């Protein structure tokens, strides 16, 4: 087709849209994440604490259910106490940094919840495996 | 078996090899890409780099369908209007440097196609559990 | 008012300058281009377009069917898309969209999408 | 240019049943055909882009098949808000040439 525009959807561009739309774009998001005489210094301190938190983020992803995938379930059934608000509200009305600031208390038990859940799956995949 | 010899297959030994058999070797070109009062800076910043650059193949590998694995397949069909050369001559002819500057022009789009199908599977996993 | 919404004069006399102006915006990104592009409903053909231009240039594309009588501008400034048709005669009595010409690609290999939605027009009537 | 022509003017059916618009071209416009829907006095929105790929945002019911110069535009479970006239854009080559135009009733 001649005469073709183009919108060049850039990085972090998706803030106040629903969690839905942005669930489509979070993989362009997550791939600008990484590239980017005593100035050098500091811009070596700044490149390698951009990598300190990469690799920070991908060992504690990979110790829950996913290695390197972006999208990720798992076997840890969603407390209703800790927002009780149900399925449409929160995945076509609300935006993130409101869901960012709704359930900024139970974060660490999450992470610990996938934690024991993925060590007990271990543990059961490697018994399952134990009678062959 | 007493009297035993040994050729030490290095690093880098398959350039002008065809790519079935480079295909077996590339397992320690892999292994081997990551190791290696102002010339420490400069050694500092050159490492630096090397991992920068690891990380980098590493992250655009890992949004595709492999998350480690070194061989990989996809569901996104090969173009023929890219190449047009079937699979005989590409497998048994073809060098690697030969090959790289023959497909040198789609590139970008063949790494499109594969972040596109990818989270399209993304997708279709996630809806796939979610009458489950 | 909306987004690609038509206004001006609804009458236009005879062999005089039709000057219809649109509101546009600018994209998510100054990287952004659109393709602005005036297209008429007669009530006699079917849709036909009248012309347009890029965001990023000053070069109208336009159809030849006018024979060239479009002045096709832009103030991205104030919003304007403009037409400024010559020698207007009755055959131009038809309600004018203005639409936005683009594409949604979401990362900068390939194209994922392309969205030529239109404004709701403005009936100009050549007597 | 490159004539569009759209069929047909008018087609009338029931509630639920799967109609097909058929755009002919008279080049090759390949796949560069789109699929809109304006409601009377209202402006066209698009339903088509590509001939083959459905716009997010309408429903399945709108699908497209067809290549080179034919296209057929196919509605399963034809719906009370498809009363509209129907439009085929060629955006091959310059100038912009649209449909004919398919009332539905």
């Known amino acids: 087709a001649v005469g073709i525009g183009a919108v060049f959807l850039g990085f972090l561009g998706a803030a106040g849209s629903t969690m839905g739309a942005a669930s489509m774009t979070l993989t362009v998001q997550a791939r600008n994440l990484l590239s980017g005489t005593v100035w050098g210094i500091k811009q070596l301190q700044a490149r390698v604490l951009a990598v300190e938190r990469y690799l920070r983020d991908q060992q504690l992803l990979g110790i829950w259910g996913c290695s390197g995938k972006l999208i990720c379930c798992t076997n840890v059934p969603w407390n209703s106490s800790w927002s009780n608000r149900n399925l449409s509200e929160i995945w076509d009305n609300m935006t993130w940094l409101q869901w960012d600031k709704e359930i900024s208390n139970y974060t660490q038990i999450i992470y610990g919840l996938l934690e024991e859940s993925q060590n007990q799956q271990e543990k059961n995949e490697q018994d399952l495996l134990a009678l062959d | 078996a007493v009297g035993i010899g040994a050729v030490f297959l290095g690093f880098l030994g398959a350039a002008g090899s065809t790519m079935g058999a480079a295909s077996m070797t590339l397992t320690v070109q892999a292994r081997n890409l990551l190791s290696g009062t102002v010339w420490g800076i400069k050694q500092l910043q050159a490492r630096v780099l090397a991992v920068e650059r690891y990380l980098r193949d590493q992250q655009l590998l890992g949004i595709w369908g492999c998350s480690g694995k070194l061989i990989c397949c996809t569901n996104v069909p090969w173009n023929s209007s890219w190449s047009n050369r079937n699979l005989s001559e590409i497998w048994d002819n073809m060098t690697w440097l030969q090959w790289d500057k023959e497909i040198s022009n789609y590139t970008q789009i063949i790494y499109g196609l594969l972040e596109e199908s990818q989270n399209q599977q993304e997708k279709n996993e996630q809806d796939l559990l979610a009458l489950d | 008012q909306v987004q690609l919404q038509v206004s001006g004069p609804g009458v236009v006399r005879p062999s005089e300058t039709l000057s219809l102006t649109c509101e546009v915006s600018?994209?998510?990104?100054?990287?952004?281009?659109?393709?602005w592009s005036w297209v008429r409903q007669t009530p006699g053909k079917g849709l036909e377009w009248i012309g347009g231009?890029?965001?990023?240039?000053?070069?109208?594309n336009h159809n030849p069917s006018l024979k060239s009588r479009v002045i096709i501008s832009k103030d991205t400034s104030k919003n304007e898309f403009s037409l400024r048709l010559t020698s207007v005669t009755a055959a131009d009595t038809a309600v004018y969209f203005c639409?936005?010409?683009?594409?949604?690609?979401?990362?900068?290999?390939?194209?994922?999408?392309?969205?030529?939605?239109w404004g709701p027009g403005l009936l100009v009537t050549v007597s | 240019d490159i004539q569009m022509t759209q069929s047909p003017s008018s087609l009338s059916a029931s509630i639920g049943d799967r109609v097909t618009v058929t755009c002919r071209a008279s080049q090759g416009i390949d796949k560069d055909l789109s699929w809109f829907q304006q409601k009377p006095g209202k402006a066209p929105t698009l339903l088509i882009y590509?001939?083959?790929t459905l716009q997010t945002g309408v429903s399945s019911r709108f699908s497209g098949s067809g290549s080179g110069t034919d296209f057929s535009l196919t509605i399963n479970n034809l719906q009370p808000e498809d009363v509209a006239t129907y439009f085929c854009?060629?955006?091959?080559?310059?100038?912009?040439?649209f449909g004919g135009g398919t009332k539905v009733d």
């Open positions: 639409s936005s010409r683009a594409k949604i690609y979401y990362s900068a290999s390939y194209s994922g999408g392309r969205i030529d939605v």
């Open positions: 590509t001939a083959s």
């Open positions: 231009m890029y965001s990023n240039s000053e070069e109208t």
């Open positions: 854009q060629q955006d091959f080559s310059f100038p912009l040439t």
């Open positions: 600018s994209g998510s990104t100054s990287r952004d281009f659109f393709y």
